[PDB]
Design a protein around this ligand. Structure first.
Ligand code: HZC
Length: 372
């Protein structure tokens, strides 16, 4: 243990004026907190670990945050979501008074979100970013373990962004995928699941998914009002993308961070959206395509077309994304004809380059917030 960042909500670790993060470290996973001593009311940091099975029937995701959003609910927030094959879901925001992140002499990174009652979520990440382990010990809620492993010939290190511009969604907003393609497993037990509130176990093995590391001093409404995130496996392709559509505060500009791997090699890295590669992400409406669920809010899309293009590509890669199974649904405004919300999906996805028709699944989510 060589570097430690330990924050408690209760102690003044949260200041009401802006703070500049630590500089972006090129060719690093930047897993150590960029706001190590204190965060501002605007600042946020994310360590996210999402999994799903190869059959697109089971999902389990954990987002660990450091931000001020959960202070009046007594902690830092962790978002835990699960879907079973019968369509039953479990979704909770979990609050933890203490968040601790350490870098160890062996080069591993450890994180612990710790409650007053002794309950915790912990992560442990390899020095070369090829493995991550989470342990859940939240009494009355969820216990178990999650593992993500990169088995690629090419090291995660060789694919890490080499500049701020390759690590950024937009100025001052960092969003990264340091593990690249991962095999996943989950063994978990939930105390109360479904209408009957009976305990249930969840298992994934040799599944798919991905890890996100992001941070900013800029709060989300200042750079977006709509976002789509997905991690997916489509035959030999592994893809991960965040795409935002701007609020009035960025003159409605769109932004994206996107990566596309072929059998563990990085083939397309895009930090630009055209709607040094570029992505195009276009919503599919239910009057255009017969397959795909819509969400329950004002966004009626039934999926997306995702294209990755180079400057020296004729056709690049095109992926058709259809919403197949609902994971979570939560409003983000008062109800009405323009009521907004957030929707998580198991996605069905197909395509590749011209002449390719690979098929697989993703774990996706979309959000709108009522910022003009
Ligand atoms: C409620 C308003 C009309 C919505 C809010 C969500 C955003 C994505 C689009 C509009 C604002 N342009």
């Amino acid at each position: 243990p060589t570097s430690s960042s330990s924050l408690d909500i209760t102690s003044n670790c949260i200041i009401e004026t802006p703070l500049q993060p630590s500089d972006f470290l090129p060719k690093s996973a930047n897993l150590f907190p960029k706001f190590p001593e204190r965060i501002s009311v605007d600042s946020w940091e994310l360590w996210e670990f999402d999994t799903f099975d190869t059959n697109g029937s089971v999902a389990f995701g954990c987002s660990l945050y450091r931000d001020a959003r959960g202070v009046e609910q007594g902690g830092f927030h962790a978002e835990v979501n699960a879907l079973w094959p019968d369509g039953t879901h479990w979704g909770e925001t979990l609050y933890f008074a203490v968040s601790e992140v350490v870098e160890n002499s062996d080069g591993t990174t450890g994180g612990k979100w710790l409650s007053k009652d002794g309950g915790s979520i912990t992560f442990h990440i390899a020095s070369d970013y090829t493995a991550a382990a989470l342990d859940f010990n939240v009494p009355g809620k969820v216990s178990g373990t999650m593992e993500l492993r990169n088995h690629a010939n090419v090291s995660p290190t060789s694919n890490l962004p080499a500049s701020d511009a390759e690590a950024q969604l937009c100025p001052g907003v960092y969003y990264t995928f340091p593990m690249g393609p991962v095999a996943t497993s989950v063994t978990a037990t939930f105390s109360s699941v479904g209408a009957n509130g009976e305990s249930r176990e969840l298992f994934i093995s040799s599944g798919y998914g991905g890890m996100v590391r992001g941070w900013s001093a800029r709060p989300w409404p200042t750079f977006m009002n709509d976002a789509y995130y997905v991690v997916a496996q489509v035959g030999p392709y592994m893809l991960q993308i965040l795409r935002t559509l701007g609020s009035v505060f960025v003159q409605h500009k769109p932004f994206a961070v996107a990566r596309l791997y072929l059998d563990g090699s990085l083939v397309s890295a895009a930090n630009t959206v055209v709607g040094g590669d570029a992505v195009r992400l276009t919503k599919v409406q239910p009057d255009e395509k017969s397959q795909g669920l819509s969400g329950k809010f004002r966004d009626g899309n039934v999926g997306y077309v995702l294209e990755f293009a180079k400057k020296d590509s004729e056709h690049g890669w095109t992926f058709q994304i259809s919403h197949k199974r609902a994971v979570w649904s939560e409003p983000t405004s008062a109800p009405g004809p323009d009521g907004t919300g957030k929707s998580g999906w198991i996605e069905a996805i197909s395509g590749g380059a011209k002449g390719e028709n690979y098929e697989g699944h993703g774990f996706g989510g979309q959000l709108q917030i009522p910022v003009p």
